[PDB]
Design an enzyme around this catalytic site. Structure first.
Site, mmCIF file in Angstrom:
data_model
loop_
_atom_site.group_PDB
_atom_site.id
_atom_site.type_symbol
_atom_site.label_atom_id
_atom_site.label_comp_id
_atom_site.label_asym_id
_atom_site.label_seq_id
_atom_site.Cartn_x
_atom_site.Cartn_y
_atom_site.Cartn_z
ATOM 1 N N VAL A 118 0.818 -1.216 0.000
ATOM 2 C CA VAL A 118 0.000 0.000 0.000
ATOM 3 C C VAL A 118 0.855 1.272 0.000
ATOM 4 C CG1 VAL A 118 -2.131 1.055 0.786
ATOM 5 C CG2 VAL A 118 -1.779 -1.310 1.306
ATOM 6 N N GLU A 175 8.799 11.718 -4.726
ATOM 7 C CA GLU A 175 8.367 11.425 -6.092
ATOM 8 C C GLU A 175 7.612 10.090 -6.164
ATOM 9 O OE1 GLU A 175 11.690 11.242 -8.765
ATOM 10 O OE2 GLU A 175 10.469 11.163 -10.580
ATOM 11 N N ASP A 198 22.270 0.831 1.460
ATOM 12 C CA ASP A 198 21.334 -0.268 1.328
ATOM 13 C C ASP A 198 20.798 -0.380 -0.096
ATOM 14 O OD1 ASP A 198 18.266 -1.404 2.997
ATOM 15 O OD2 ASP A 198 19.905 -2.536 2.090
#
Length: 252
Positions: free
Chosen positions: A22, A82, A128
């Site tokens: 989600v 963004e 990461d």
């Protein structure tokens, strides 16, 4: 400036990404598609958060997912980034129930290398880099995310000097990029799928690496393999990798 008025947020939506993911969607200032993310309370001081937000906003590259601003006058803090319609690269690679030609996979690698060559040029460490931390937009362009304040341990993406000494450098981002190329070329498999963390590290310690994915040509594998040199200073820069990737694009 860096600070954002939540009243400039319109068309707030709760959107799906992948099967169970989600996203909180909004429009910012009438024309920017944004994702809305919250910051864990108490994990950072307010001043420490703002400075880091400032650094991240000055990191402008078309292949980096942009940070548009933060809201601090509220609890919890949130950031607006963004919006990327095609979502996570990992899910997108596995959702290949259709498309991927090898040229498309190499282009993905090029997109990421560009963002990373930019970060390297600003001496900013991602820490990461992984397919789970890249996002895909509606045009199929791959952008790097989750750098900066967009942060058990990514052992399967880490060079030996991170695991043992916590020695982070651009050369540790280089290693993770090689693993990311592997995730792309294997279409979203788990690196070292059936390994405990000691097994993975013992495997690396033996001078062993991630197998050649079969969609990767000898040349493409040479590039990803180069990222995993035992010695950090023997691994390429993102500028050299880009040039390698651009070479292989010409040769096809």
């Amino acid at each position: 400036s860096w600070e954002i008025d939540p009243k400039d947020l319109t068309f707030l939506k709760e959107l799906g990404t992948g099967q169970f993911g989600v996203v909180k969607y909004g429009k910012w200032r009438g024309q920017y598609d944004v994702a809305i993310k919250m910051i864990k309370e108490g994990s950072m001081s307010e001043d420490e958060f703002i400075e880091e937000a400032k650094v991240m906003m000055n990191l402008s590259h078309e292949k980096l997912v942009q940070l548009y601003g933060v809201c601090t006058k509220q609890r919890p803090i949130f950031i607006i980034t963004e919006y990327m319609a095609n979502g996570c690269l990992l899910n997108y690679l596995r959702e290949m129930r259709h498309r991927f030609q090898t040229q498309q996979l190499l282009e993905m690698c090029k997109d990421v290398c560009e963002a990373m060559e930019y970060l390297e040029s600003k001496q900013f460490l991602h820490r990461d880099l992984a397919a789970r931390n890249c996002l895909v937009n509606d045009q199929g362009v791959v952008k790097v995310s989750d750098f900066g304040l967009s942060r058990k341990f990514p052992v399967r993406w880490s060079p030996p000097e991170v695991l043992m000494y916590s020695k982070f450098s651009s050369k540790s981002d280089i290693w993770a990029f090689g693993v990311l190329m592997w995730e792309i070329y294997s279409l979203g498999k788990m690196p070292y799928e059936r390994f405990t963390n000691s097994e993975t590290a013992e495997h690396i310690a033996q001078g062993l690496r991630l197998y050649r994915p079969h969609l990767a040509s000898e040349k493409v594998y040479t590039i990803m393999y180069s990222c995993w040199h035992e010695k950090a200073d023997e691994r390429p820069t993102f500028k050299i990798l880009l040039s390698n990737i651009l070479d292989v694009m010409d040769e096809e």
